[PDB]
Design a protein around this ligand. Structure first.
Ligand code: P0T
Ligand code: P0T
Ligand code: P0T
Ligand code: P0T
Ligand code: P0T
Ligand code: P0T
Ligand code: P0T
Lengths: 143, 326, 326, 326, 326, 143, 143, 143
């Protein structure tokens, strides 16, 4: 929509500090640093290749809109999340115990705040059995 | 007792479906059972022992029916552990699995046969023997190892076939007249195949000394070319097992997965560029951990360590230069 | 449609010449076709089925003619993709390739045969069977693996030959009189070769107990020495495949090549010592990246990293010493 | 001479029990001796040489009794070296070892037999032949290598059995009437097993050309599937030997052991939290050195080095930052 | 022309003694020559072609005499290149080499035979065939690979022998009466050995169905146990070749050698603690470079690098601490 | 006993400087540094992994009492020390020579003061044969 | 020619700062640094190995003239250039696309200025088809 | 001899600066640093184990005399130097070319002064053929 394009342009201008339509790695690093965390050269460059669809190190506004156009369902990211959860499903029964889930969120990979894992237990536990499922959960995120 | 009920159901599902340890023993039992049936069928063919063979085979077949029926129903019941098979529709979909369909249909066909039906019984026995795999694991493994060495097997076959053709033709030329074994080139081809494989019935063998010399010269290399595939596949299997054992320890698929799930959750909660881009990044890390599972990861680790160290050394150089200027 | 024409021409050249994936399926088809012809020829030899064999073989040979002719013309047309084969002279040079010459000459000779010609037909069929390689790839691979293990195969042959000679002689001594199989040492040699290879026709076998004991003692090791080449070559093939799989990932031939082309261009544009020296340097790097393709590159990387870090530490020592002096 | 007595006792224990070098020669001798007896038994079966065979066998059996009795008593005496077997009770427990019990009981049974007893003599000879292992080492090694490749052997058996069944059935269909060899499917199964193993007696072979073609087609892959286990196990054995040779050098089991013994002594003398925690820590290091014995230890070493260097670089950064602030 | 004379003499010594490349071709020629003689001897045994075989064999033997005599004299002359064989005494010592003695004595014996002498001719031909090795290289390689896998071959032999004995006994029990093939246990042992090796003459095979079932059950594993040594040795040979190829590149035997020679010269010129101790040190480094020739050297390099870097970090810590105090 | 629990509580309070019952790694490091030696990060992480029976990075007092309740005989640590001694038993006869024993104690692994090895030679050498045994020695430590 | 030898002598004198006819690695490094960029120790040692024809670490003037006498065609460096271009010829059709060519020149190996790659697209593209050839191109460089 | 023992004791006192008869690594390092070259911990430790015959890290005078009792012929070091020379003998003819010999001495392993290699060429050239031998040469060093 018109307002959607306007807010995307505002976000791009905030990101592309140069204003020439060619967003660079340094701009991403600076904006993220403003957000709070320090990004690495490998992190930012991989970000750039994933976003870039031309191969010149910069992304124009139409490419930015195109990458925003991908939703959770459209991206078809299902297989990856299911297999990751199976990797975590040390029992493999299709459900993950609450204790192990919280331990993984608060002690593994990217350190996740207790608020996020609290939100997971709140939303994913429709049946409230403790052995929270990662299939209906991912189905509802997909939807 | 719902907790104990669920524990028992999960144990039953694990033992019936992909097992790990002593669960396999159960399968062995049932396998032997079905295998026994097969053997009895062969014994029923010998007219000397046909009566006793059939007498035992009837009860063994009834026992197989009972065991397979109870196993199938228990498997259907224990399918509830997995989320994908819950309730009427879920368990109907579970029964939609190709091997469950095969199991139910073979069970029904066998019970119907119980109620020249012998040929159908033999075909059903071999059908259950093949269904014993239940996953295609053996076929998958053999196909993987064969395709990995496809070039080697193809060259072995090509050179061995050329050796077979040439040796058979030359021995045929040297034995066409003075030996009735090699009456026609087809007979010589049969001889060449039987010898180069080293089966060597002895129904056909060269008798003229020219033929014997030619056969010696050619078989001396033909036997090796024909035995090559066995050695190639054996070595491939052993190397695959060794590399699997080595890779069993690294367990470097954990952090990328946690990052992926966390980033997916963050992006889902976002509903923005940073979150979506980080979700893509975490998926990238997930797949890039998925692929290597080998020493290439170790070379990547060396590269990362070296480049990081060089960066720190450059920072050191800047610091010392500025201190000197200070 | 010149763009689409060029795309189609390149696709045709790729499928006809070195293919990668499903293109190979086409080859399989044609291969089977030619293979079928060969088989039919063998069937024509059996007088029981000679009539039907020849009846089918005529049409199969004409089909082979059509397929090979159309394939040859399409290959000549699609040779235009590569620069070396353009225009009249370029395509004439392309037809100068040894396998293209073989293909055209076999096509023409077969055409003439269509217009005791059976022997020529069989020879042409085997000729196309061997030409099916089109590159010598199988021979190259077998020769490489054999030459790599030349010492091992030679020792295996030497020891196995000594075992064969000695065992045949001893069994001949133990069976010269009491058995007509071993009438002459040549017969004993034939027996020894047939057993140690484990072909074992049974036309000759020891019958005296001394001969049986000697044959047992010697064959127990002779069979292993004779089976050695198969195992050696199989293991060599498997190890070669494994190392190829490992080396498939490194892809460390990129930067040296770009440096080489850039330096060559710079030196060409120069028309000075720096340019020529750098051209030689870049060529050196190019070929030194070409060679290793193995772990020696990794050991070189470790050496480079360690010496670099040591140099940085020496710079650290100088800086800290000067700061202390300050 | 108690020092010399103890030295001799330890040497005797080492040579009789697990030896290292030329001690094995002694075993070879005794082994040959017992092996000789076995051979003579077989010779006693041949009625042509039964008299001389038995005449020599009686003397060889008495010699075996003498040698085994003296060896058993010397072993019991030399068992004093180890602490666990000292004095009356200790040596009684040593005689409680399963193989010592087997040795004493076979000795007693043999002497009793000396005082249709031939069958008992043959069974005792084979019993001592099997007892020659004295440790189960061969069985342990074979079981280890087999279990490591259990999946590969199982797939090879499954596919080879399917090939055997199918090929036998098809050849039986193609040869049921026109050949008395394949009168019954059991005969066809016997033929298929004999050929696919490449034993190939020649008592049964296909004679109809359809049967010959089917047998060729199926044996061409069946022989490979049947020879697979030999190649798989050979490659597994060779790889195990190679990795044992590689791992023989690292010797990284020393410091963890010293730490473990020291911490255990300290905790024993404590009778506190630090001592017990350090004892647990040292045991943990002991076991963690025990497990890997492979390249996983090397990857752990790389990880440790990299993380330590990272920590030192972080200290470097802190120091340079504070100096800049100064 | 003394320079050209010495160049030619060195070239002759290199080609006659250990060659590298195309020099081997010459050996092949002479080898074929002697091999041809051997073959002719076998042909002389066949009474059908004895006359022509002997007629050609006389000429070939005289040609071998000429070739070996000229080669021996040229080798003696070219032995002057090496320092150890100079002048009368030096060349006499060179002729003292075991293979030179064998060559001269076989030459003289063959000359005398030229002037039932056929048996001596055959023995001399096989003697020169074995002398063709000239170094024991084949025997050394086979012994090395066998001894490396001694445990594996011994377990394979032990288990295969037990399988042979047990299978032969059971088949003998199942076939003692209803088959004249298995009249005595020795006959059953012969059958078991012939089948388990897969030679399978067919002179003896089980005919009772109990015997056939037992033979199937036992041979199914016996054939694998008997084929094991071939696979084990083949894999060992292939792995040895692969590791030789890998180790061919490192070339880390240079600096220790130069240090050793320099220190030896210094110590010789000393005639003191520092020089002698450094000579011992350099010898130690020489042998420590001699030993590993494997990845243990690489792990040592990692250890050296890591400890050195840690020492540099400790120096860094001292420097930064003192600067902070400054 | 009551005094045993009191002394365990005193030890825990000296250890758990925070006093909240959640002992951390830094407290153990500091108290050990007071004891004289510097513990490493990996050493302390392995320590906390071994002692902890919950999986939160801290040990409650009941867990500390439970791990203290394990005696030398109760822990069944016999196999480990026996196999370590056989590893040192370069001759494998069941006895270890005094010279090699002292050399290893004072020069290998954690270098140990001459007093401790003197105590070993004093107590373990019941027979005083120089070829001091380790099986009876470890047996009497077990008892 | 006489002027050719004179200019070679001038270049050598500029190179061999010592003037004794024994050019050292340090002189190469210094003059090259004058030329703008920094050479590495391994780079310079490989250079001296490639140029030296005696094995003493220094190059005499006749050797310098000899290595200058080698022309592009004389050096017979064709095979190396063709195989390098094939290495870049990801399609292997005998032609290289302009986009990939420019990306490789300006982003891989030794970063090459836009002027050099512009000169490549100018001279090498005789047919101007975008799918520029590299075989005839290396032929004309050889000629 | 008496003078031999006296000079050996003087050398030991110069080495063993402590004077207690227990020479340590640091003493060798310091005295030989006075001699000129810089040692390494590994170098001096290998020195000590090679010279030590007790296993305590220090050498008493009798051990020093015993290790000095080994003359060139007595040490039986023939095989090692022969195999090293064969390693250098790239041709393997039994003689080493003078150019390669000098290059190795002055450019490989321990950097040896031109004087030492000059002495080698002087003494070893009994025949003066340029292709100096290393068997008669090592034979006279042994003698
Ligand atoms: C050319 C090949 C491939 C082999 C290997 C090289 C050599 C010199 C001969 C061939 C060969 C025979 O052709 C025959 C025998 C034994 C004679 C058999 C008895 C009639 C051995 C034997 O190695
Ligand atoms: C291309 C193969 C398979 C090799 C290499 C070429 C030649 C000379 C023989 C083959 C071969 C055998 O086929 C058999 C043996 C065993 C002894 C044979 C007795 C004469 C060794 C042996 O190297
Ligand atoms: C040099 C070879 C090939 C080895 C090593 C030397 C000896 C003792 C035997 C060979 C060998 C067989 O030839 C066969 C088997 C299988 C069982 C044989 C049954 C008696 C094992 C087995 O090691
Ligand atoms: C389908 C399989 C597995 C093999 C391999 C692929 C091909 C095209 C044919 C089979 C095969 C025969 O079925 C028969 C022969 C020779 C004829 C034997 C003489 C009667 C060779 C031959 O490779
Ligand atoms: C699945 C196996 C075992 C492979 C792969 C599938 C096919 C085409 C053949 C097998 C095989 C042979 O069974 C035998 C040879 C030797 C030459 C045979 C002569 C026609 C090669 C060869 O690849
Ligand atoms: C116990 C062993 C070692 C094998 C493997 C395991 C199984 C279940 C049976 C044995 C075995 C036969 O004993 C017989 C056949 C075929 C029948 C031969 C035709 C008379 C196959 C067959 O695998
Ligand atoms: C200890 C060995 C050698 C293995 C493992 C134990 C058993 C079950 C069989 C052996 C074996 C065969 O002896 C033969 C095959 C080929 C197919 C046989 C057809 C029934 C596979 C196969 O694993």
């Amino acid at each position: 929509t018109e307002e959607q394009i306007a807010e995307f342009k505002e976000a791009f201008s905030l990101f592309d500090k140069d204003g020439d339509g060619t967003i660079t790695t340094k701009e991403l690093g600076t904006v993220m640093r403003s957000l709070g965390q320090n990004p690495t050269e490998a992190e930012l460059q991989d970000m750039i290749n994933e976003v870039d669809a031309d191969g010149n190190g910069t992304i124009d506004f139409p490419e930015f809109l195109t990458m925003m156009a991908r939703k959770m369902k459209d991206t078809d990211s299902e297989e990856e999340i299911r297999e990751a959860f199976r990797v975590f499903d040390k029992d493999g029964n299709g459900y993950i115990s609450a204790a192990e889930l919280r331990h993984v969120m608060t002690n593994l990979g990217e350190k996740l705040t207790d608020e996020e894992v609290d939100e997971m237990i709140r939303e994913a536990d429709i049946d409230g059995d403790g052995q929270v499922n990662y299939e209906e959960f991912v189905q509802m995120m997909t939807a | 007792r719902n907790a104990f009920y669920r524990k028992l159901q999960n144990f039953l599902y694990n033992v019936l479906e992909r097992p790990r340890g002593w669960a396999f023993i159960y399968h062995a039992y049932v396998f032997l059972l079905v295998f026994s049936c097969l053997v009895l069928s062969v014994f029923s063919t010998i007219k000397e022992y046909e009566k006793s063979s059939e007498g035992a085979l009837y009860i063994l077949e009834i026992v197989t029916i009972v065991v397979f029926g109870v196993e199938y129903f228990v498997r259907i019941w224990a399918a509830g552990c997995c989320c994908r098979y819950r309730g009427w529709r879920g368990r109907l979909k579970f029964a939609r699995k190709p091997f469950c369909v095969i199991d139910i249909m073979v069970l029904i066909a066998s019970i119907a046969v119980l109620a020249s039906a012998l040929r159908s019984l033999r075909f059903l026995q071999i059908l259950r023997m093949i269904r014993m795999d239940r996953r295609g694991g053996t076929w998958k493994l053999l196909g993987s190892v064969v395709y990995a060495h496809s070039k080697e097997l193809v060259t072995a076959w090509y050179i061995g076939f050329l050796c077979l053709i040439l040796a058979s033709f030359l021995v045929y030329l040297a034995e066409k007249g003075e030996n009735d074994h090699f009456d026609t080139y087809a007979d010589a081809l049969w001889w060449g195949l039987i010898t180069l494989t080293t089966i060597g019935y002895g129904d056909k063998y060269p008798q003229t000394w020219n033929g014997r010399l030619l056969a010696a010269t050619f078989t001396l290399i033909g036997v090796s070319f024909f035995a090559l595939p066995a050695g190639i596949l054996g070595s491939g299997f052993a190397l695959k097992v060794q590399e699997q054992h080595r890779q069993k320890h690294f367990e470097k698929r954990r952090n990328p997965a946690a990052g992926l799930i966390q980033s997916a959750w963050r992006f889902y909660a976002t509903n923005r560029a940073v979150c979506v881009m980080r979700f893509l990044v975490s998926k990238r890390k997930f797949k890039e951990s998925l692929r290597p599972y080998d020493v290439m990861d170790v070379i990547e680790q060396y590269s990362a360590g070296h480049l990081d160290m060089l960066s720190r050394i450059k920072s050191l150089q800047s610091r010392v230069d500025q201190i000197v200027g200070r």
